[PDB]
Write a protein that binds this ligand. Structure first.
Ligand SMILES: [Cl-]
Length: 232
């Protein structure tokens, strides 16, 4: 593709391996692809195979456990994780995912998500964690991004951590999806996205840019209750 430069060099592998060397607990990642009709799937697999390879190995166990699924032979898995589009890179039960290759600047958010899940720590504020525990109502976060986008990683990280925090507390009502615009132009145009990152929640554009955690919590709570709040 023309919108991202996949770096599988030894230099990157070295840098990645060094960061992942600090992983605490193992993390499973689920990659959904299609044998055909998916231009970026091959690259996504190369990228994710690289991540798995560079993750630490402790007692024959790779700290990053890669699972790869194809639309055809893995139909039930797609249904289980509620994956309709490919390529998709998901964690948990699919509540944290990238719909579209997490290349370019997204590598930063992908690494951080892996690290935080590994550390059993979302890194969110206590107030946020407490709110997510009891949050009622489903929340579908779509953070529209592109691989080259410099600030997207921060927005993606935030939404993903919200989904993770809720999920780890046994309240998986949040689906945080990082939607790569080039592979999913319809979603980007559904929200009239002019600049990335842009964030939609429950089918409506909610924020343009990277929001503050505390503010995002308000957006999430309001979305859950089907209400509109001020970016304020
Ligand atoms: Cl397939």
């Amino acid at each position: 593709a023309r919108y991202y430069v996949l770096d599988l060099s030894e230099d990157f592998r070295r840098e990645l391996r060094e960061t992942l060397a600090e992983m605490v607990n193992p993390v499973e990642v689920h990659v959904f692809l299609s044998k055909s009709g998916c231009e970026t799937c091959e690259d996504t697999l190369r990228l994710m195979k690289l991540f798995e390879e560079e993750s630490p190995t402790r007692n024959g166990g790779k700290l990053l456990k890669l699972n790869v699924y194809y639309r055809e032979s893995d139909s039930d898995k797609f249904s289980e994780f509620k994956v309709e589009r490919v390529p998709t890179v998901a964690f948990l039960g699919g509540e944290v995912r990238w719909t579209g290759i997490p290349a370019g600047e997204e590598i930063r958010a992908l690494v951080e998500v892996i690290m935080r899940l590994s550390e059993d720590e979302s890194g969110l504020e206590d107030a946020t964690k407490e709110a997510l525990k009891s949050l009622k109502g489903r929340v579908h976060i779509e953070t529209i991004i592109t691989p080259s986008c410099p600030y997207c990683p921060y927005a993606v990280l935030l939404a993903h951590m919200f989904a993770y925090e809720a999920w780890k507390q046994g309240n998986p009502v949040i689906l945080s999806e990082a939607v790569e615009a080039y592979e999913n132009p319809d979603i980007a145009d559904k929200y009239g996205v002019m600049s990335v990152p842009s964030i939609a929640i429950n089918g409506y554009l909610v924020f343009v840019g990277v929001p503050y955690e505390e503010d995002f919590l308000d957006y999430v709570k309001s979305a859950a209750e089907g209400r509109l709040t001020v970016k304020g």
